[PDB]
Specification:
The structure is cut from a larger assembly and holds chains A, B and C.
Chain A (H helix, E strand, L loop, with lengths): L7 E6 L10 E6 L7 E4 L4 E4 L3 E3 L7 H4 L3 E3 L19 H6 L6 H4 L5 H5 L10 H5 L11 H10 L6 H18 L12 H16 L5 H6 L3
Parallel strand pairs in A: 5-6
Antiparallel strand pairs in A: 1-2, 3-4
Helix pairs in contact in A: 7-8
Chain B lengths: L2 H8 L7 H14 L6 H18 L3 H18 L7 H17 L2 H9 L8 E4 L4 H11 L6 E5 L6 H10 L5 E4 L13 E4 L3 E2 L5 E3 L4 H8 L5 E4 L18 H4 L5 E3 L6 E4 L2 E3 L3 H9 L2
Parallel strand pairs in B: 1-2, 1-4, 2-3, 4-7, 7-9
Antiparallel strand pairs in B: 5-6, 6-8, 9-10
Helix pairs in contact in B: 1-2, 2-3, 2-4, 2-5, 3-4, 6-7
Chain C lengths: L38 H12 L5 H17 L9 H19 L4 H15 L7 H32 L7 E5 L3 H13 L4 E6 L7 H9 L4 E5 L3 H4 L5 E5 L2 E2 L5 E4 L3 H8 L5 E4 L51 E4 L6 E4 L2 E3 L4 H7 L1
Parallel strand pairs in C: 1-2, 1-4, 2-3, 4-7, 7-9
Antiparallel strand pairs in C: 5-6, 6-8, 9-10
Helix pairs in contact in C: 1-2, 1-3, 2-4, 2-5, 3-4, 5-6
Classes of the chains: A alpha+beta, B alpha/beta, C alpha/beta.
């Protein structure tokens, strides 16, 4: 019963004109001893309506959602995370690319790497660099953006299932690019998304300041 | 990490219970927490309670963790600032520790009256609450005899007898198989508890339940002395419904409330029907 | 409206309880367009007397729907206030429904809640808004007292069912069947033992509902229950009302089943919602019960009926009990929307709300 208490409820508001852009999630004041279990990834509360609650500490999030469960809490904000903490590869480039708009990519006139900046959604988007920036402290006033980004690439209504599907898509992309699965846990999904997008950008760069920052790694 | 070291070092006071040390460690880690949101603090302390009950497999640790989480939720429901709310949580935790560390003395003061002059008391294993109750009773110029079982898993009965011999109280160590033999010579049974379930029963040493039955077959009074932080929202239907995290030769078992006469807590002398009322009023 | 007189000879112990007939009806003493009672009200009374609507939740929901329609089609007269007028008008309707069939505990609680709501309506506020507010209040009551309560009870009972269990049920209960189906859908693999009894034989309503869901089920009568209990793991029983003294008022074959289950060390579980809790107490099944139609005990055995003309014998009288009271010592726990509580926590829930 104590594991069911909430503080803010994610109002899943999926209007359908375009599912990849204008789907949003805003948190309202709702403790009300919520009926279902609550999972906290990074200051964001998700009700476990479809999935169940799992205990213990495992390696990755796949180890949790393979049995049909989700951990009580996991991520960088947890001192004792249910998943093993890990670092990443190309966070530096994803942070240095936080000064350009997407109009800066479209004014160049090339659609080759604009393809590469369409993995998580299919629509040309670059807000993952704004998420993975150095300034972007993950606290309050930022849950809505992260949850809307998760819902826009989830293809579902239950936020936990959207998280699981996003992690599955991350793993599928890593397998398609010949990368390992142990390099991509469920610790920080946004950083892994940014790393994959930046790797695809680096791969598509030879088909072309932005070019310098892209070719600065080899 | 280092939370287990602090929790095990807090148990350098031989009189401090495990749940009290767990609550003190939780309050210390709430004080030293650098979080800026209530959800992150709740999740971190939940995982910390998980680690603590992973270290010590007693029901009292889980009860204290659930009580601390309920207190956190209650203090968060009011202010909703997490700064003034954090100061309120700190001061309320200080007051709660100061009030809960002296509950054993109150339990003894309110329970030692039920012991007559020349009666016979039966205890199962070593517990600090029964020891304090017997000390408060012998301090009132009372004379009685004490029978204690050896508790074969870990010989706590011999330790209880050695602790009682320093109080100049006639104590006799009996075997665990001789419970039904000395049951007729005992005037009352007084046992401790590691956790009080919702309905009113207790969760205690493996040789407790079989002693509550033999007393019921002889109309012997059966009293349970336990603190308030041991109230846990559990409902075991039988001996198999007890979670394996608490039993592990089982190390613990459940006793139904129909075999319990009275409970002596810091809230007073209660019936097995008051624990459920308290747990419902708490909304744990 | 004339009074419904008793049919047949009653038992000397149940002489204070009305005994009616299924063939007997008060409609033959009323108008075809109802004058004193409401059309929805007489329809509900006829459906209750004929036995078309017999489930507790079903009866209460039908009563609340009829009351919604009555409140919708009711307009206040001049010089009158709705707060007193509606309550004074609803009393003959309730008395007529009682004369049709004795009201259950859920119906009594719904009537009390509706009276408390109608009395609480302001005086200066309009009627076109008061009727809509009453309808919305009844809808919210139905939504949060039956549906969400059943969902919470099923969620609380799911964690008590294990793989390989042998659950034993009795009669036909909506909550028990919903819990079993939800547990089978979530992933629990067990089997159910359905216990039935004469003359209603409503247990078949559950059996055919468990086969359609794929749950392995067994069927047997109540006198042979002691034969099947050694292999039963848990006993799930439905309750019509939880008395203030901890006793459980349910179908006539509930207390006996709970007693026989105790002799086999089988835990007895009772499922009920908090809106069926009553402040009244009861020590036995004699001070208050319902005497059904005694002609239902007549069975077709072989080629003749032994009780075909039982009324010809002055000393022969048939007893048809509908309800039974189980003491609190035979019940282990009660699953409500507040969780799993002991059978001694009934007044507490009555005191909180």
């Amino acid at each position: 019963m104590n594991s069911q208490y909430m503080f803010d409820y994610p109002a899943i508001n999926i209007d359908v004109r375009c599912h990849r852009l204008l789907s949003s999630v805003s948190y309202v004041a709702y403790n009300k001893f919520h009926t279902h279990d609550v999972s906290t990834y990074e200051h964001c509360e998700i009700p476990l309506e479809k999935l169940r609650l799992g205990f213990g500490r495992r390696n990755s999030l796949a180890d949790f959602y393979s049995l049909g469960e989700l951990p009580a809490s996991w991520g960088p904000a947890c001192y004792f995370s249910s998943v093993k903490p890990m670092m990443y590869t190309f966070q530096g480039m994803a942070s240095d690319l936080s000064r350009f708009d997407l109009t800066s990519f479209s004014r160049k006139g090339l659609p080759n790497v604009l393809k590469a900046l369409s993995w998580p959604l299919g629509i040309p988007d670059c807000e993952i660099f704004s998420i993975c920036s150095d300034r972007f402290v993950r606290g309050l006033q930022t849950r809505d953006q992260l949850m809307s980004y998760i819902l826009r690439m989830g293809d579902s209504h239950s936020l936990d299932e959207c998280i699981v599907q996003a992690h599955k898509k991350i793993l599928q992309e890593a397998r398609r690019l010949g990368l390992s699965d142990e390099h991509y846990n469920g610790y920080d999904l946004f950083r892994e998304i940014g790393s994959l997008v930046c790797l695809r950008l680096i791969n598509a760069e030879p088909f072309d300041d932005v070019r310098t920052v892209i070719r600065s790694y080899r | 990490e280092l939370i287990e070291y602090f929790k095990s070092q807090m148990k350098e006071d031989p009189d401090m219970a495990s749940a009290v040390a767990a609550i003190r460690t939780l309050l210390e880690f709430l004080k030293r927490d650098k979080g800026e949101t209530i959800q992150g603090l709740r999740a971190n302390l939940t995982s910390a309670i998980e680690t603590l009950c992973g270290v010590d497999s007693s029901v009292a640790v889980s009860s204290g963790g659930e009580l601390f989480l309920r207190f956190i939720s209650l203090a968060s429901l009011e202010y909703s600032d997490y700064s003034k709310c954090k100061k309120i949580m700190i001061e309320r935790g200080e007051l709660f520790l100061r009030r809960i560390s002296l509950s054993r003395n109150k339990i003894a003061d309110l329970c030692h009256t039920f012991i007559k002059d020349g009666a016979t008391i039966l205890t199962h294993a070593y517990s600090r609450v029964v020891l304090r109750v017997l000390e408060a009773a012998v301090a009132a110029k009372k004379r009685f005899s004490v029978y204690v079982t050896e508790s074969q898993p870990d010989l706590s009965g011999k330790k209880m007898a050695k602790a009682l011999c320093h109080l100049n109280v006639p104590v006799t160590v009996v075997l665990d198989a001789a419970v039904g033999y000395i049951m007729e010579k005992a005037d009352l049974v007084i046992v401790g508890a590691e956790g009080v379930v919702e309905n009113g029963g207790i969760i205690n040493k493996i040789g407790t339940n079989q002693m509550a039955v033999c007393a019921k077959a002889q109309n012997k009074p059966f009293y349970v002395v336990a603190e308030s932080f041991k109230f846990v929202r559990l409902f075991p239907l039988n001996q198999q419904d007890v979670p394996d995290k608490f039993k592990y030769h089982p190390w613990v078992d459940y006793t139904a409330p129909s075999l319990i006469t009275l409970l002596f807590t810091d809230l007073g002398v209660l019936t097995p029907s008051a624990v459920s009322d308290e747990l419902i009023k708490l909304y744990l | 409206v004339p009074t419904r007189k008793d049919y047949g000879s009653k038992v000397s112990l149940f002489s204070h309880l009305p005994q009616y007939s299924r063939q007997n009806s008060l409609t033959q003493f009323m108008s075809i367009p109802s004058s004193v009672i409401h059309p929805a009200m007489v329809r509900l009374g006829l459906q209750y007397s004929q036995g078309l609507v017999s489930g507790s939740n079903a009866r209460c929901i039908a009563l609340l729907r009829a009351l919604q329609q009555v409140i919708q089609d009711y307009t206040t007269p001049p010089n009158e206030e709705l707060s007193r007028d509606l309550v004074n008008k609803l009393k003959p309707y309730m008395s007529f429904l009682t004369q049709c069939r004795p009201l259950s505990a859920s119906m009594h609680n719904a009537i009390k809640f509706l009276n408390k709501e109608i009395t609480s309506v302001g005086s200066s506020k309009r009627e076109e808004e008061a009727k809509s507010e009453l309808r919305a209040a009844i809808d919210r009551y139905v939504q949060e007292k039956i549906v969400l309560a059943a969902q919470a009870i099923s969620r609380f009972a799911y964690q008590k069912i294990s793989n390989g269990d042998v659950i034993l049920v009795y009669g036909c209960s909506s909550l028990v069947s919903r819990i079993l189906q939800e547990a089978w859908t979530e992933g629990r693999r067990f089997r159910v033992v359905v216990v039935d009894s004469r003359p209603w034989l409503e247990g078949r309503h559950t059996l055919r509902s468990l086969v359609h869901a794929g749950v392995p089920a067994s069927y047997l009568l109540i006198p042979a229950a002691s034969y099947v209990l050694p292999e039963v793991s848990k006993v799930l029983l439905g309750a019509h009302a939880l008395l203030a003294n901890g006793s459980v008022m349910s179908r006539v074959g509930t207390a006996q089943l709970a007693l026989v289950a105790r002799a086999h060390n089988v835990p007895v579980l009772v499922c009920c919602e908090t809106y069926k809790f009553c402040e009244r107490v009861q020590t036995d099944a004699f001070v208050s019960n319902e005497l059904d139609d005694p002609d239902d005990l007549q069975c077709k055995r072989g080629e003749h009926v032994a009780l075909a003309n039982w009324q010809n014998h002055a000393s022969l009288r048939l007893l048809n009990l509908v309800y039974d009271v189980t003491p609190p010592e035979l019940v282990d726990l009660v699953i409500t929307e507040l969780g799993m509580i002991p059978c001694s926590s009934v007044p507490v829930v009555l005191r909180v709300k």
